[PDB]
Every structure is written in C-alpha cells, then in structure tokens.
C-alpha cells in the first residue's frame, strides 16, 4: 500500500528491520529539558533546568531530581506521564529488592530490570514505548554508577553522557572534558556548563537543580545549595 | 502480493507467508557479528556489543553474552533491548529444566522451550516478531560441546560451528573453513575466533569496548560459563593482532 | 485501516483471505510421501536442510507423534529450511495425542490424531487473530486395529483417506507420479513399499539417498528409522527404472 | 497543518507519531481551548485559593446545581478546566482513586501525591489501544499540613510538575503572566489576601471583570476540615473590594 | 602528603612573608617528592598539588631557584598517570602566562613535555602544553620557533580529531603569522578553530582566545572594522577574569579597529567603564593620542606619541605591527593636499601646513621619492620638492619599443630556416 502502515506498528514488525518508532522517541526527548549525568568515580551527579523564574514550583515536595530509594535518584527528559508511571512501578520493584536483601538496588541491576519493563511496552501493539530517557544514578558496593536506558527498553553503560535538548554537543563536551577518575565538587561544575550549552533563556537566580549521590548517599539539594555551585561556572 | 495484508500480527499476510521475518533476517546483519566455535575442552562465543564508545561503566561484562544457567550460556545478534525480557526468561526455563531432570540441560531442550513463546508472538496476540537470533552454547554429557541457532521465527538446528551476523551468508561460510574438527583446543579457537570476528567486521583493529568474549569450559566433570572481562579480552585480541597486522599495508 | 488488508472480510471469491492463502501453499520446500503397506506404513522424506554439519537430530522432518501415527510435512514460505511453524504443531499434536492415551487407553488411531489436527487448523479461523497452519501433513500410521491407513490432511484443514499420497514440490505433481508406481501388488509386498516412497521422491533428487530419510512403523510399535546408510541401497538400483518413465 | 502526521496508526490505535509525543496527546492540549473555562490559582500561607468561571450562561440554570468545584478528598478540593465531557470523567476517577489511597496511608491525602497519582492512571488512558488521553486540568487545592497550602496543576495526558502558583486555560499564558508578578513580590498571605491576588490577576486577562453569581471560588482553610465552595455571600464582598482596592 | 598544606603550603607563605633565601630549603622538600611521590587520590588532593605549585611559581618574585623547581611540574605530571593528569595541566597554563616562573627555563620544559605527551597521555593533554610553548616563545619573538613547534603537532595529526585544547595552538600561531604581516597561512588555520568553537564546551580563557585572534585577522588585513572590533568586545571580557597581560592587549585592540575606520565616537565609549578601567593603563592613552593625531591630520602629533609610550607598545609584536601600518596610511594621507598644486613648492611652506617637523619632513620626502608614493621629485641642492608635472605623450616611444623588441624574436626564428638556401 505504502509504509505508513507497515512502519508505525508495534503490532507488526517495521520493514526496515529496526523500529522507527524508538527513534520518535528520542525526538521526544530532545523536544523535553536538558539533562546531563556525570559518574565522577567520586560520587555521581544528575543536574537538570527546573522552571522556577520566580519561583513557580514547589520544591518542597516535588522535584526533577527524585529519589527511587535510599541511594538512587533519577533525572529525566521527554514525556511526563510516561516517567510518572515508570517512577512508581521503579520505586516498587526497588522496594521489593531492599525487602529481600536489606541493601537498597544497584544502578547496574535495576537498568537491567527495568529495561525488561519498558522491552514490554516496545513490543506489546496498541502500546506505545515509554518516552522518557533515564539518567540513573547510584552509589552501591563502594562505587558510584551512572547508566542510560534509552526509549527502547535497554541500558547503555555510561561514565558520562547526556540527554534532552542538544544531546549532540553534550556528549561532545563530556568526551572532551572529562577525565577517568575526579573529585565530585569539580564535576558538578562542569555539569552546570552541560546544561548551559542548550540551556534556553538562561538561568535566573536559581533555575536549575542539582542532585548529587555519594558516599552518604542520594541527596536533591535545597536550591540555596544548588546556587553555590553555578556561581563557581554558570 | 501488490499490497500487505499484514500491519498487525492479528491480521495477516496476504499470500499467507510472512514478510516481517525477511526483514528479521537482514536486522541481524545490521548488528554485529556473533560467532560460536566448538572445543575439546570448552566452547567459547565471541559477540560485538552494542557500546563502542569510550566511556564505559563497565559494571558489567555481560551486555550481549548473558549466562543464564549453572550449564549453558546464550549471545545476542540484533536488537537489545529484545534481550532483557529474553533472558530472565531464558533463566527460569533453564533453572526449570534442572528442578524436574536435574542433568546438565541439553542445548536442543532450553532453544525448542525458546521458540514456543517466539513462534506464538508471530501468530497472534499482537506482538511484534523479534529480530534478534541467539546463539547458546552448553555442554551435555550424551553428544558433548553443543551450539545451537535459534532464528526470530523459531526455526533451529544444531551446528558446531556457526556464525550469524555483518552478513550472514558471508560468515557462516568462512567459519566453517577456518573451523577445523577434532583438532581443537580452547586456547587456539579463542584466537581464531578474534580473527575471523575482524574479517566479517569493517574494523581492522578490534578492541574490548568493541567486543565482549565468553568461554565455557568444563572443569573436574561440571560446566563453568564466565563472560570475561576486559583486560582478559585484550590478551586474546594482541595475540590475533600481530598476523592482521601483516596483512596490512 | 482497509476493508481487504483485515482479517475480517469473507471475499468475492466465497472463502475467508487467510484460509484460502494457506492453501496455496502446500508445494515447494521439503517433500512428504507416505504409502500404505500391509505390514508396514512407510512415510519418507526428501530435504531435512541438513548442511552435514547440522545435526539431523535436531531437524525431525518425520517425527512420531504416537506410538502407531507418525507424519511427514512440507510447506512453502518466506526463509528456506523453516523448523518452527512445523515444530509448534508437532509439539502440540503429540502431547494431545500422549494425552488421549492417558484418557482412553493403548495406542490412538490414525484417523482420530487426523480429525484432530484438521479441525486444529479450522479452530483458529474463527479464533481472535489467527490464521490457519498451511501444513499438509501425510499421516501415516497403523490403528490398535492393525488396519492400516493412509491419511493426509490439507491446509483448511478438510481431511481424506488414501492408498498412497504425495506432498511438496508441486503438491499436484507427485501425486500424480505416485499414481503410475502404485498398484494393489506394492501394498502387500515388504520390499515395494519402501521402494513406492523414494520412486516419488526422486523427481527432485537431491544428494543422494543419504539426505532422503525414511521410516516403517509397525502395528502398535514406535518409529523406527532405517539408517541413511540402508536408504542408498533402494537408491542406486532404482533410479535407472525412474529415468525411462519420465 | 497541525502536531503530528495522520500517517499511520497514531488514531487508529494508539502508536506514537514523528514527534514522539501521541498524535493525541498533542492534541489533548487543545481541548482546553474547547472549554472555554480560564483558570487561576494562588497558593497562600494560610489557605489555598483557586478562582474559575462557573459558566453559568443563563440564571435559568441554578447558579448553586451548576458547580466545577468538586470535593475529592475529606478537605482535598480541585476545580476543573477545559472540555467539559473531559472534565466530569476526570473528576469521578480522581474520587475512586482518592478514597482508596485515605483508607490505605490512613489519613488525609497529600496534595502533591494526589496529583502524583491522577497523573499516573491518565497515562494509562493514553496508553490502552480502544482509550484516549483526556482533554482536561484538575487544579487541586489543599492544605499540607506540614508545608502548607500547595496549589497543583496536571496537564491533559497526564504530566505531572510542581507547582506553588499556577493558571490554566484558553489564556494559559496570559494567565500565568500576571500571576507571575504577583509571585515575586510576594505579598503576606491571609485568607483575604490571597482571594483577592487570585481574582485580580483573572480580571485582568478577560478584561470584562465577575460577576458575584457567576464565579466559583473554593478555599481549603484552616477553619475547615472540610472542603468548602464560597458560593455567592462570600465572592459578592471580595468582588467589590477590587475596584476599590487599587 | 602536600597539597595545600605542610610543606607546600609553608612555601607559599615564606616567600609573601619572608624573603627569597627562606623558600629554598623549603622547596628542596617540594622537589624530591614530586618525582614518583604523587597523591594519586582525585579527591581533592591531587588537583589542589599542581595547583599550589603553580601558585608558588607565578606567585612570581622570579629568581634561577624557582626555575629549577619549574623543571619538576613535569615529573609531578608523569606520577599521576591517569586521565585526570590531563584536566589539572590546563587549569594551569594561565598561571604561568600572566606572571612567568622565569622565561628561559620555561620553553625548554615544554619542548621536553611534549615527547612525553605524545606517547603516554591523551592528545586531550598534549594540545594544551603546545598552546603554552607558543605563547612563551611568540613574546621572546623568535617567531620561527614558536611557528615550527606548533606546525610539528598539527602534521602529526588532524585525521578525524579536533578539539577546543587543539585549536588554542592555531590560534596562537595565527597571532603569530599576523605580527610578521601575512594573512594566508593564518586565515587557513582560523578556520577549522572557528568550527569547534559554535557550540560552547571551553572555559572562558579558551572563548577570549578564539575571539580576540578572529578580530585581528579582520582588523587590519582584510578590512572589516565592524567584525574585528565585535569579536574584539567578547574576548576582552573572557580575559579578564583569569589573565592580566592579555587583557590589557584586547582593550587597546578595541580601540585601534574604530581609529582605523576614524570615527572619535567609539572609540571615546570604548575608553570608558565596561571593566575597562582596571586593565586601562598608560597604553589607552597611546590609543587615544593617534585617534586625535589621525582626526585632527597632524603627522606630528603621531610620532610623539610612538617614541613616549614605546616600551609597551613594542613588547607585543601584533600591536607594533598593527601601529606600523597605520603611521604609513596617515603619512600619506597628509601629504597629498599640501603638494597639490605641483610645481616647485617650497619643503618649508609645505612642512607648516602639514603640521609637521622641519627635520621630519625631509626624511618623510625622501622615503617616499623611492617608493613613488607622490611621483615628485626632491631637490637636496636647492631645498625645494618638485613634483613632476604631466609630460607629453610617453605613448609614441612605447609604440616602438614594442613593435621592435617583437621582431627580434621573430628574426632569430627567420635566420634558421634560411640556412638552407645558403
């Protein structure tokens, strides 16, 4: 007939013979906010642009950095409900996990888990994929993690990568300036700088927030202590 | 045909023959090459990943080589994030194998428990027809070292040597010439099998971001499946690396 | 989405599109002959897409469903030397089988695991989403009776007794072959029976009597496979008597 | 044209277009504007205000019988904003889904979990292949009683984000605009103030001004432990102090 | 071990404190632990340790005992031995620009690190050691050298890669090829530096760099003050927070794009506080002095100006050159309306109207008669300039000339044929 029909399907198989439809949802991503993790070898950070600009936004219990369970958090892109949906079914399957071994999940295993998940959703017909792309970070055995799930259902193994608006440059500018191994403090200033690429309009007093995972554990900051940060580089 | 009656798997083609696992077929030569080599004292599986990027967690090893039992261990040729639901469903069938026969599962019984699930998505419940053949590799004690094939429609056979993937047609033919039979060791089908992973290939270097190798070997009687890791991975690729350097200009 | 293009749509031509396409295909890749024999049944296969370095073990192109009824297939589609439509039918037609068994005793009849499997196919014609099997199945067997039947089955899934039927590289083709070998002196004679399978199959010869694979089945006994080895002594000899005829 | 492509199933059945987002979903937006309902809302420290056009074209309707403000929770309120058939389907789901969550958790629910979790069965909406997304906002007001008055927003498919002042409707963006201003120079909050910033940012954008009969404002103080509709006694005073005030 | 504290640390004191014969006792402890002693930690620690050395050293105070120390960054540099060793060398390359650790002992380090550089680090590492070599060389003006060293880098290789760390060595090279006064080889490599620059991914020392190079080659050579001078407002800015001698150069340059074009407006705004005025020094007041001598038409009001601020002026090559240029334009300028009506105008008569020297003016006359820059001529034996006036027809001679040079060719063609007969 044409391939209008043929293409589009999650209930039939593309005629190309890998899905255009992953590749609509990265678009999606890339039509979201920017986003961008960075595993020092330190601690992990996951820093996105968060619309306050005056301050619009309850950031007292709700955020865009948030955590899954103790020392977990993510950062996202594209889809709001998609994410929503993700994040409780994430949480759940987190809990079961501490549950059972009494030590919260690791970053490598629950990609791997929840890519199984949002595979389902890639396959099923008359259900469209999860459109949010995940920044996962964590701090589990002794060593921090950094992980990309992509639309797809699968994860991608990361030292530092980004998403959203011009995902293009960000990773150009995380090949170039980034170094095997660095202290966690410089690392949030060069993710502050990722954003600032295709940031839009540009920060106000405070319109980003940073998360930071480490040692202690994943932790949102407060947006004062967020803005201490994108003083040292905007 | 002049018109697909296909668009949905709860509709059908019409000539009633299936164009979606043609195109199945050409997804594997898409993704990188997979090749099994057979042993007298193991099996080893070679697979390029995904990933070719430097930056690398590297928390696992296993991303396209999944062992699944305490006997058999399986790679990916095609899609990835086919995989995931593949292979925790691959270990329940390979666990549920042992708690009935508690034998060292065969390769021919853990693919036809396979390809009961593939060949149903294809007739109905709306599913889309996979794109991913795998190649399992395992050990049983009535016929040896076995490799098996496993297509996206279901369809099998038994090799000892195969290889699938960066055109097809090409490499299972050069496979089975530098396969040799019987005179074999672990060790040197390990470094054939970086060789002739890198003439299928467009690269003429190879690295262990680039790829990611998997022995079985059997040791005092029971199957041990480690994907290795990377520095492991180099040692194999330097001690291939010296002839394709010749060949070079 | 179109009026033509769904499942639903039961055609100008008075038969459903996906049942009718089925149909069409019963020719090309492998090839099933089965005849009937006083003492033996006799089903052989021409193709198991065996490279020789392929297992034959693996590939059952004559597979025992029962421990009297065995069958042979061949089928046409898309990506040569196909295991799994085959394979999914097997499975699910020996398990019922093994399971009639376990309901109503000793070795199940030709004719009933043939009823079965055609009204299988039919089932699903009106069942969400599902096409008919395009196997035709020569299912060859003996009944507890000893009676020996010769059954095959079609697409649609309309079932019909023979003496002798030929199936795949051009269905119409080796049966009508099969026709000039067959006569009622073949059917009690041990050696013509075998003889009767590989003389239909040797119009698409394909390397030598090795690839050819044949079996006798025997009153209520299990499949016994003759080795591939024994099959190329009936070849050598016979094909010089095939060549005159065609 | 417009967001998305018709080509292929995108309304069909549910299965993304080009851009990613739901052929729909994009669609989904536009609803609002169907509506014809402007919505603000004003987060204080002593109530959460929300003001909406009643839509009462005619006093042939009974101003009271006609209502967009629903009670969903024990002292949880929200109003409704955008298409009207959306609105209504939205508001008897978000209460099955409101009283089950206040017998498990045992106590009244968050404002911010309970937008959390409309946000998440309307992505179910979208999802399912016979369903389509809804067309509507719920603006939830309550009292944390922890953290304070918190005022909330959910977008048509399901989005969820964070909100301490908020506007929907034809005029989204004009809305939030004026609403905008009165954030920064926050003004000390009480439950006269807070009612007052809320009407005036709306009357600016319509630029026609209430009437005290066809405006429903709803308030979660803390007098109440109930949710309560201000009804015409209360709007009637506010609505004469505007002129005056500045 | 050190970092910012004990050993270290005591150094950076004694030598703000104390006096120099303090700090060497001190810096033999620095020295002998840097050498496969390292904090391999990227915790803070190791940063932190290059760093307090590269305070210490462009702490300045220079003297021959801080040299040596400088020979030691490199042993420092090959310890750590990991991708984070390349981060920390371009972080410090600024220190040492602004305020040297001694000049002589510096360029020799750096020849020695590249070898190193090359083989064990990434080439992340590598561009940025190259970028300082060039610098350090380019202000000792053996031009040559910097130009060889940076050419040495780029034909090793560009085959896939570029880099922001990559252009910074083009772009100082370019600065270089300007100050000899050639435009091509530095417009080639202006290009592929521009390229990875749209999309930002540097830190603004880079920034300042990439702009302030694209406005001198837009400047003066190709003529085009309105983008020499908005690449110029950028740079400016990027420089002053980490750099002190390059921004000064970035603010003169400002000036000098809006004097060439000869308008007082902008340069005026220009002078004044953007952060101008910190930077500002004796120099913007050169800048301005040439503004007004180029406006005003006064010669003389411009060579006082060169002689009185001269040692700045000089000390960066690119403005001399950039200033060279401009006092031959205004020379001539001026000249042509004093001469104008030909004859035998007197040198003195001429010398007042100009507003020029008695003594200069002769010179200025006698430089120009050779490179025909009026097409006069100037009479030493009377004290007079004559200018030639048009003569007859040159056209007539020409004719000729052209016709007979033509047939002797032909002649010699003609002779050889003829042979034959006899």
Not at chain 3, 12 to 19: E, I, K, N, S, Y
Not at chain 3, 88 to 95: E, F, L, P, S
């Amino acid at each position: 007939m044409a391939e209008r029909g043929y293409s589009f399907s999650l209930t039939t198989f593309s005629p190309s013979g890998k899905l255009v439809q992953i590749e609509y949802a990265l678009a999606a991503v890339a039509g979201g906010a920017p986003s961008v993790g960075i595993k020092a070898a330190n601690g992990v950070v996951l820093a996105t642009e968060k619309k306050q600009k005056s301050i619009l936004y309850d950031e007292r219990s709700v955020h865009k950095v948030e955590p899954i369970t103790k020392h977990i958090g993510l950062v996202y892109s594209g889809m709001g409900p998609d994410y929503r949906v993700l994040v409780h079914r994430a949480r759940k399957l987190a809990q079961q996990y501490y549950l059972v071994y009494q030590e919260p999940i690791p970053t490598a295993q629950l990609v791997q888990r929840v890519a199984s998940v949002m595979q389902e959703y890639t396959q099923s017909g008359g259900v469209r994929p999860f459109g949010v792309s995940l920044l996962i970070c964590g701090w589990n055995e002794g060593r921090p993690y950094l992980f990309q799930s992509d639309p797809s259902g699968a994860y991608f193994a990361w030292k530092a990568t980004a998403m959203g608006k011009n995902y293009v440059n960000g990773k150009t500018f995380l090949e170039k300036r980034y170094n095997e191994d660095l202290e966690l403090e410089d690392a949030i200033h060069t993710a502050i700088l990722t954003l600032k690429e295709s940031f839009e309009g540009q920060m106000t007093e405070d319109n980003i927030e940073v998360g930071i995972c480490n040692e202690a554990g994943f932790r949102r900051l407060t947006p004062t202590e967020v803005r201490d940060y994108l003083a040292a580089i905007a | 045909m002049s018109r697909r009656y296909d668009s949905r798997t709860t509709i059908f083609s019409p000539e009633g023959r299936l164009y979606q696992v043609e195109y199945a077929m050409e997804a594997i030569g898409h993704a990188g090459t997979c090749l099994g080599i057979l042993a007298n004292d193991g099996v080893l599986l070679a697979a390029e990943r995904r990933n070719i990027h430097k930056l690398l967690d590297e928390v696992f090893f296993s991303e396209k080589i999944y062992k699944l039992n305490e006997d058999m261990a399986c790679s990916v040729a095609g899609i990835t994030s086919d995989a995931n639901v593949l292979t925790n469903e691959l270990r329940l069938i390979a666990q549920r194998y042992l708690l009935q026969y508690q034998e060292p599962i065969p390769c021919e019984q853990l693919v036809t428990a396979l390809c009961d699930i593939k060949q149903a998505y294809t007739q109905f419940g709306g599913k889309r027809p996979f794109g991913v053949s795998l190649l399992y590799i395992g050990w049983d004690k009535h016929y040896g070292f076995q490799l098996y094939q496993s297509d996206p429609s279901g369809n099998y056979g038994g090799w000892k040597a195969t290889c699938i993937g960066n055109n097809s047609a090409a490499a299972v033919s050069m496979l089975k010439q530098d396969y040799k039979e019987g005179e074999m060791t672990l060790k040197s089908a390990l470094a054939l099998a970086v060789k002739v992973l890198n003439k299928t290939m467009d690269v003429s270097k190879l690295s262990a971001e680039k790829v990611e190798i998997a022995t079985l070997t059997r040791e005092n009687g029971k199957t041990v499946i480690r994907v290795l890791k990377q520095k492991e991975v180099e040692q194999l690729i330097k001690k291939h690396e010296e002839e394709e350097a010749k060949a070079e200009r | 989405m179109s009026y033509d293009r769904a499942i639903t749509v039961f055609s100008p031509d008075g038969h459903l599109f996906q049942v009718e396409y089925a149909q069409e295909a019963v020719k090309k890749g492998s090839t099933a002959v089965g005849v009937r024999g006083r003492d033996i049944v006799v089903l052989g296969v021409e193709k198991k897409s065996v490279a020789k370095l392929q297992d034959e073990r693996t590939v059952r192109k004559i597979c025992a469903l029962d421990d009297n009824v065995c069958m042979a297939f061949a089928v046409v589609a898309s990506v040569s030397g196909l295991t799994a439509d085959a394979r999914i039918v097997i499975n699910r037609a020996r398990v019922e089988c093994q399971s009639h068994r376990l309901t109503v005793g000793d070795p199940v009849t030709v004719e009933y695991i043939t009823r079965y499997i055609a009204s299988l196919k039919q089932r699903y014609t009106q069942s969400n989403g599902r096409r008919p099997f395009g196997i035709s199945a020569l299912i060859v067997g003996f009944d507890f009776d000893g009676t020996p039947r010769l059954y095959q089955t079609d697409p649609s899934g309309t079932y019909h007794a023979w003496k002798a039927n030929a199936i795949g590289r051009g269905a119409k083709s080796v049966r009508e072959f099969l026709e000039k070998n067959y006569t009622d002196d073949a059917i009690e004679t041990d050696d013509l029976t075998i003889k009767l399978v590989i003389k239909a199959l040797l119009e698409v010869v394909q390397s030598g009597g090795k690839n050819i694979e044949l079996a006798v089945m025997r009153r209520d006994q299990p499949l016994k496979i003759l080795s591939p080895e024994e099959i190329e002594k009936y070849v050598a000899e016979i094909e010089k008597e095939k060549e005159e005829n065609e | 044209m417009s967001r998305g492509s018709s080509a292929g199933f995108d309304r069909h059945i549910t299965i993304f277009s080009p851009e990613g987002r739901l052929y729909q979903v994009e669609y989904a937006f536009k609803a609002i504007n169907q509506g014809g309902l402007t919505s603000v809302a004003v987060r204080g420290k002593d109530c959460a205000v929300i003001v909406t056009q009643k839509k009462v074209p005619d006093k042939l309707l009974d101003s009271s019988t006609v209502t967009h403000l629903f009670k969903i929770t024990e002292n949880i309120g929200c109003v409704m904003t955008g298409m009207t058939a959306d609105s209504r389907s939205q508001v008897q789901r978000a209460r099955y889904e409101a009283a089950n969550w206040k017998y498990k958790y045992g106590y009244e629910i968050p404002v911010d979990m309970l937008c959390k979790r409309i946000a998440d069965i309307s992505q179910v909406y979208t999802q399912n292949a016979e369903m389509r997304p809804l067309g509507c906002c719920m603006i939830l007001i309550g009292i944390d009683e922890e953290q304070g008055p918190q005022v909330y927003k959910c977008d048509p498919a399901g989005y969820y984000c964070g909100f301490k002042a908020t506007a929907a409707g034809v005029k989204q963006t004009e809305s939030t605009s004026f609403l905008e201003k009165k954030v920064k120079k926050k003004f000390d909050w009480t439950f006269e103030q807070t009612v007052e910033t809320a009407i005036t940012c709306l009357s600016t954008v319509l630029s026609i001004d209430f009437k005290p009969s066809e405006i429903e404002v709803g308030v979660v103080t803390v007098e109440n432990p109930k949710f309560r509709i201000l009804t015409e006694a209360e709007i009637d005073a506010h609505l004469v102090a505007l002129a005056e005030r500045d | 071990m050190a970092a910012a504290a004990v050993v270290e640390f005591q150094r950076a004191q004694s030598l703000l404190s104390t006096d120099r014969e303090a700090s060497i006792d001190i810096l033999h402890s620095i020295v002998k632990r840097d050498i496969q002693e390292n904090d391999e930690e990227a915790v803070q620690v190791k940063e932190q340790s290059i760093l307090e050395l590269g305070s210490l050293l462009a702490k300045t105070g220079q003297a021959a005992e801080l040299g040596g120390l400088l020979k030691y960054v490199r042993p420092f540099l090959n310890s750590i031995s990991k991708a984070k060793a390349a981060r920390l060398v371009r972080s410090l390359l600024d220190l040492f620009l602004d305020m040297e650790a001694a000049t002589g002992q510096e360029v020799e380090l750096c020849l020695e690190c590249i070898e190193w550089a090359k083989s064990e680090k990434r080439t992340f590492l590598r561009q940025a050691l190259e970028a300082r070599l060039v610098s350090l060389y380019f202000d000792t003006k053996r031009y040559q050298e910097a130009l060889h060293l940076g050419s040495q880098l780029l034909r090793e290789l560009k085959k896939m890669d570029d880099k922001a760390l990559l252009v910074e060595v083009q772009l100082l090279e370019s600065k270089t090829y300007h100050a000899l006064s050639n435009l091509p080889k530095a417009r080639a490599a202006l290009t592929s530096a521009r390229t990875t620059a749209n999309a930002i991914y540097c830190p603004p020392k880079l920034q300042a760099t990439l702009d302030m190079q694209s406005g001198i080659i837009h400047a003066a050579e190709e003529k085009d003050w309105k983008t020499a001078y908005s690449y110029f407002y950028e740079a400016f800015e990027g420089y002053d927070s980490i750099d002190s001698p390059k921004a000064i150069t970035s603010l003169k340059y400002m000036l000098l794009c809006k004097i060439m074009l000869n308008t007082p407006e902008d340069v005026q705004a220009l002078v004044s506080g953007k952060l101008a005025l910190r930077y500002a020094g004796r120099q913007t007041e050169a800048l301005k002095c040439v503004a007004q001598a180029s406006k005003n038409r006064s010669l003389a009001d411009f060579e006082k100006a060169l002689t009185d601020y001269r040692a700045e002026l000089r000390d960066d090559p690119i403005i001399s050159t950039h200033l060279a240029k401009l006092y031959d334009n205004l020379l001539e300028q001026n000249l042509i309306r004093v001469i104008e009506p030909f004859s035998r105008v007197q040198i003195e008569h001429i010398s007042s109207l100009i507003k020029l020297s008695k003594a200069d003016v002769e010179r200025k006359l006698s430089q120009m008669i050779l490179d025909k820059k009026f097409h006069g001529i100037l009479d030493q034996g009377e004290g007079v300039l004559i200018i030639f006036d048009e003569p007859p027809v040159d056209k007539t001679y020409e004719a000729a000339l052209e016709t007979i040079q033509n047939m002797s060719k032909v002649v010699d063609s003609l002779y050889n044929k003829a042979k034959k007969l006899t």
